[PDB]
Amino acid sequence: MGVTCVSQMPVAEGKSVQQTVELLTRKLEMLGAEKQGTFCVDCETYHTKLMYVMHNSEYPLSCFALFENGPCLIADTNFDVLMVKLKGFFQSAKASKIETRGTRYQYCDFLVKVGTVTMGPSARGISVEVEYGPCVVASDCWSLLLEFLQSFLGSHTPGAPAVFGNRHDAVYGPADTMVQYMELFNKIRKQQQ
Amino acid sequence: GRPKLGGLMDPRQGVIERTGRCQTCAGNMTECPGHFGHIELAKPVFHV
Amino acid sequence: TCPNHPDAILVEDYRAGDMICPECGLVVGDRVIDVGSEWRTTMSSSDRAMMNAFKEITTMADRINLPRNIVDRTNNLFKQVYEQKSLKGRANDAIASACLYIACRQEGVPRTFKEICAVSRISKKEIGRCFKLILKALETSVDLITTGDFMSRFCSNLCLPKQVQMAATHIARKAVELDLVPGRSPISVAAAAIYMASQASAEKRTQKEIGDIAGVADVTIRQSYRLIYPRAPDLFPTDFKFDTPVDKLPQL
Amino acid sequence: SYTGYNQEDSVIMNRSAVDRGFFRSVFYRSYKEQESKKGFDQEEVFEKPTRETCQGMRHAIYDKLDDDGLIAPGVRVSGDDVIIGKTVTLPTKRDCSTFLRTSETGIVDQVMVTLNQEGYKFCKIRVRSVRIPQ
Amino acid sequence: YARPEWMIVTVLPVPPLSVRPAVVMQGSARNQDDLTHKLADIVKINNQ
Amino acid sequence: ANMTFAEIVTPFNIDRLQELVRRGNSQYPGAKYIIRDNGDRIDLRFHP
Amino acid sequence: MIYICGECHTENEIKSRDPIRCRECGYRIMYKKRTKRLVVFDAR
Amino acid sequence: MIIPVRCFTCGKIVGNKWEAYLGLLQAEYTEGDALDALGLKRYCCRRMLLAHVDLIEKLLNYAP
Amino acid sequence: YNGFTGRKITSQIFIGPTYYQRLKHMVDDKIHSRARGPIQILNRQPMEGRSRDGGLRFGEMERDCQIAHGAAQFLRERLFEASDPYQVHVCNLCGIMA
Amino acid sequence: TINMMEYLLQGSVLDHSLESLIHRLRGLCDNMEPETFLDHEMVFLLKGQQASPFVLRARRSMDRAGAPWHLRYLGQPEMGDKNRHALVRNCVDIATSENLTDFLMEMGFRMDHEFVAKGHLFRKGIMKIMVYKIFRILVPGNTDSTEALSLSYLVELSVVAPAGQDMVSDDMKNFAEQLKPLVHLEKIDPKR
Ligand SMILES: [Zn+2]
Ligand SMILES: [Zn+2]
Ligand SMILES: [Zn+2]
Ligand SMILES: [Zn+2]
Ligand SMILES: [Zn+2]
């Protein structure tokens, strides 16, 4: 678990959704960053309250089920199979699935991932996550993430996230990154326009 | 309302309903070839 | 009955006429469904009596041009009554006539007992008695007849205009609502309303004529009309073109 | 004798002319369905059934039908489509609905409901299919 | 293969269901075949 | 597309028949049924 | 469920239970109104 | 039923000439003279107007 | 002039307006196929179901044609395998099955 | 993913002879020191509109520290052929985080019955033999006090096969046969 921050960066001007990622990723490459593979984050939804199940590719076997403010269960992939078996019993929702797919760039112990939350078949928006694997402590590693973001992100740099929340010596968790992703996804689904 | 032994629609003679199997050869409608019954005539009868 | 799927609902198919498990696709049954049918795309005494009753029912129905649906309902009612056998002592003709009357009532186009008798050799009294017995045997009931039920037929047989028919229907319904004809038969009330409307419109029909079509004596029509006459302006529809003013309507 | 495709009483047609409506036609097919209350408890009624209410139904979609069990005009209808949804009460209610010809693929042109000579409700549905020369 | 006495009908074979399968009409009203009706006739007469 | 020919699966044609099965009945050319050594028939469109 | 009278061309709502008949005309031939669902035609 | 928009053979616009053709016929032009005035030179186009039957006019006599 | 090449056709074609009629016989209404389709109750033989898939009659003339061809396997297929294949268990001692 | 079918044969041993069976299993099985596991299992049922309640079995290992809770779904019996002489059920095995109890309750699954199982686990090839003494749990929540459901211990032979091919039951029947004089392991239907 390494402190992470995810924010949405608007494409701006008349730059196409893809055109902006191409440019932002080249700007990241212009940090001496080297590509270290590909990352896929695919999330499905249920209208039950509301259930969310998300799975970052960075984690090979885990599937995360988050119940809004309620607890997140980090479970094996067989969890998706249990979900499908229950499916007739379970609620399904209507094409609310949201995915962000983009390149992973490594810059000396910081992994930066810029992706386009493509809703369904049509892209709309952009998610940036900067993670620090060495920084086990969180909520005060904010100075680091902020300085690195001002280096590359510049404008639209986020003024923290609430997943850090109350000041505590509590260690950062894979659950916290998933909660950041869920808030970001709720915003793309509803930003509209 | 159910098949009865010794009746015309004897379940032994074959399958009654499509989603069913006869008790003799335990075969479905397609597999079961149908099995003959017999009637004892109290008096001998000529054959036309 | 998919072997690998305990309690699996097999979906029917029309292309091959087979039932197939939807989750694996296994074909359970080769050509078992018979899509041709599934997809629509010496006489016994009792049966002979029933056949004669059906023939009589058809004759009576055609006498007054009743629809085949009413005929079929009458046939079903007669079958039920005849098998129930509580009316075995009564004539099959009377049972058939009462069944025809009940079928008309249930279909919502009631015919008067006199109307049924006009087409049946059985008398009105016997028809009514058999009707009561049939109702008891069937443990069913028939909605109470209203004046509006007979207006269409009576006005059409009298060849009155649609406006006159509407005026008569409104007059009868309003009279029943106001309770100006308590206890009076609906047929009598309808005949009186039709007479009022006819006398207020250009097409004027005599009491004898209206009684002839409606099956009601001119004296009964006179009584009902006298009961509804004082409030004729109230009964008449607002937008009615009075050829004869309501004040100058016949007084009798 | 242009290309040999008109040989032996055959004909070569101008595709551009056909595109311009040349010898184009309508095919109207009328389906009549009557609901009959004949039988002690065997009655037929026009209505859109349900996959569970009836004794048995089909994979064909019944969403085309309306609350009265009749397909509205202007709706495209192809094979395995229900145009009239009928239910006959089982002596549940068995599905007695009617389908179209699988090859036929047209639009419901006119739907009329009336009482036949027998006084039973019945509906006539005229389906319109456009035949372009081919 | 053929004895003259066998020509006289003493035991009457009953065709299987597949030979004279029961039909369904007007819903679930099982329409028994003509063979079923005739077999009912012989059964009644034989019992009598 | 409506008419089909049953081809026996061989190492010579295993890949081609697998591709046809993957295409399925939806898009021509494809396949309609798969028959296992058990002789049972599987409907491809019902099972994708 | 709107039906158009075949004689006077009057729209009227009708349920599955009430008889099929014009509310004012009395005419017994009814035509269903065109579906609200929109169908696309290629102008070919 | 109604005058075709295009000549079936060559595709010339022919759907806007029916009313003018009828007007000329009323003005006593011979059919050939009216076609020439309308500018239909090819006999393929002339056939459109010459052999057209306007059934829509009678179809409109039935109440909608 | 040839449409494909634009070259004048050597022979001069006879061309003019003629009144043609479109007959009701369309290939759409006549095309029909049958491949492993529904069968009837008793005969277990093909019958058209929910479509025009009732199959084609392999008549006595076709049987004689295949006999003349000598294609015994194809004839057996058409009359037995394609129409209503069936297998029964029969006792060797007494020919009647059970 | 392919589904995982569990082949199960269940039998009982009275306590007096437990020592003989333990020695015997050690000899036939692979040479591994005995596991001596202790675990707490709570079954959750979902009372939805469908009459059958979904049953998910949640297991926590009290004895083994730092080991994740295991959640499993057990399908209806698929036993058909008499020759197989085994009970076949569909099974999905998923390791879950400690916050499993809360997630299930918020989802709507309801805790029903809880038991604590203590005993020895031994394995031969894929086959796993578990010998355990089920203990009833009293008081609404706790594991401090347990009473014995029976003097005897259930012995279950379980294989989590991939569902590819078969003859898995045959191997199980042969192994069961050896323990048959010491204890009759047979397929006992859950019903009554
Ligand atoms: Zn059998
Ligand atoms: Zn299956
Ligand atoms: Zn009208
Ligand atoms: Zn032209
Ligand atoms: Zn033998």
Curated annotation (Swiss-Prot), chain A:
Entry keyword Transcription regulation: yes
Keywords attached to this entry: Activator, Nucleus, Transcription, Transcription regulation
GO molecular function: DNA-directed RNA polymerase activity; transcription coactivator activity
Entries under InterPro entries matching the protein: Mediator_Med20 (IPR013921)
Main location, first listed in the record: nucleus
Keyword check for Transcription regulation: yes
Example GO biological process: DNA-templated transcription
Subcellular location: Nucleus
Cellular component GO terms held in the UniProt record: core mediator complex; mediator complex; nucleoplasm; nucleus
Pfam families: Med20
Family assignment from sequence similarity: Belongs to the Mediator complex subunit 20 family.
Function of the protein: Component of the Mediator complex, a coactivator involved in the regulated transcription of nearly all RNA polymerase II-dependent genes. Mediator functions as a bridge to convey information from gene-specific regulatory proteins to the basal RNA polymerase II transcription machinery. Mediator is recruited to promoters by direct interactions with regulatory proteins and serves as a scaffold for the assembly of a functional preinitiation complex with RNA polymerase II and the general transcription factors.
Oligomer status and interactors: Interacts with PPARG. Component of the Mediator complex, which is composed of MED1, MED4, MED6, MED7, MED8, MED9, MED10, MED11, MED12, MED13, MED13L, MED14, MED15, MED16, MED17, MED18, MED19, MED20, MED21, MED22, MED23, MED24, MED25, MED26, MED27, MED29, MED30, MED31, CCNC, CDK8 and CDC2L6/CDK11. The MED12, MED13, CCNC and CDK8 subunits form a distinct module termed the CDK8 module. Mediator containing the CDK8 module is less active than Mediator lacking this module in supporting transcriptional activation.
Protein name: Mediator of RNA polymerase II transcription subunit 20
Underlying gene: MED20
UniProtKB/Swiss-Prot annotation, chain C:
Annotated residues for binding of DNA: R40, K88, R90, K125, K132, R184, K208, A217, T220, R222, R226
InterPro entries the UniProt entry points to: Cyclin-like_dom, Cyclin-like_sf, TFIIB, TFIIB_CS, TFIIB_cyclin, Znf_TFIIB
Consequence when changing E38 to R/A/D: Defects in transcription start site selection. Supports a level of transcription equivalent to wild-type
Reported effect, R68Q: In a colorectal cancer sample; somatic mutation
Effect in UniProt of substituting K136L: Reduces interaction with VP16
Entry keyword set: Acetylation, Acyltransferase, Chromosome, DNA-binding, Host-virus interaction, Metal-binding, Nucleus, Phosphoprotein, Repeat, Transcription, Transcription regulation, Transferase, Zinc, Zinc-finger
Result for mutant: K136E: Reduces interaction with SSU72. Inhibits interaction with VP16. Inhibits RNA pol II transcription activation induced by VP16 but does not affect basal transcription
Main location: nucleus
Organs and tissues of expression: Expressed in the inner cell mass forming the embryoblast. Not detected in cells from the outer thin layer trophoblast (at protein level).
TFIIB-type zinc-finger residues: 1-29
Region annotation (Necessary for TATA box-bound TBP complex formation) ranges: 180-252
GO MF assignments: acetyltransferase activity; DNA-binding transcription factor binding; histone acetyltransferase activity; nuclear thyroid hormone receptor binding; promoter-specific chromatin binding; RNA polymerase II complex binding; RNA polymerase II core promoter sequence-specific DNA binding; RNA polymerase II general transcription initiation factor activity
EC number(s) per entry: 2.3.1.48
Annotated compartments: Nucleus; Chromosome
Region (Core promoter DNA-binding): 125-129, 185-188, 219-222
Documented effect of changing G89Q: Decreases BREd-dependent pre-initiation complex formation
Entry binding sites for Zn(2+): C2, H5, C21, C24
Enzyme class: transferase
Protein name as catalogued: Transcription initiation factor IIB
Taxonomic lineage from the root: Eukaryota, Metazoa, Chordata, Craniata, Vertebrata
UniProtKB/Swiss-Prot annotation, chain J:
Entry's localization field: Nucleus
MF GO annotations: transcription coregulator activity
Predominant localisation class: nucleus
UniProt superkingdom: Eukaryota
Matches recorded under Pfam families: Med18
Keyword Lyase: no
GO cellular component: core mediator complex; mediator complex; nucleoplasm; nucleus
Keywords: Activator, Nucleus, Phosphoprotein, Transcription, Transcription regulation
Annotated positions of the Phosphoserine modification: S52
Protein's GO biological process: positive regulation of transcription elongation by RNA polymerase II; positive regulation of transcription initiation by RNA polymerase II; RNA polymerase II preinitiation complex assembly
Family as reported in the entry's similarity comment: Belongs to the Mediator complex subunit 18 family.
UniProt function note: Component of the Mediator complex, a coactivator involved in the regulated transcription of nearly all RNA polymerase II-dependent genes. Mediator functions as a bridge to convey information from gene-specific regulatory proteins to the basal RNA polymerase II transcription machinery. Mediator is recruited to promoters by direct interactions with regulatory proteins and serves as a scaffold for the assembly of a functional preinitiation complex with RNA polymerase II and the general transcription factors.
Subunit field text: Component of the Mediator complex, which is composed of MED1, MED4, MED6, MED7, MED8, MED9, MED10, MED11, MED12, MED13, MED13L, MED14, MED15, MED16, MED17, MED18, MED19, MED20, MED21, MED22, MED23, MED24, MED25, MED26, MED27, MED29, MED30, MED31, CCNC, CDK8 and CDC2L6/CDK11. The MED12, MED13, CCNC and CDK8 subunits form a distinct module termed the CDK8 module. Mediator containing the CDK8 module is less active than Mediator lacking this module in supporting transcriptional activation.
PANTHER family, alphabetized: MEDIATOR OF RNA POLYMERASE II TRANSCRIPTION SUBUNIT 18, MEDIATOR OF RNA POLYMERASE II TRANSCRIPTION, SUBUNIT 18
Name by which UniProt lists this protein: Mediator of RNA polymerase II transcription subunit 18
Organism: Homo sapiens (Human)
Gene name of the encoded protein: MED18
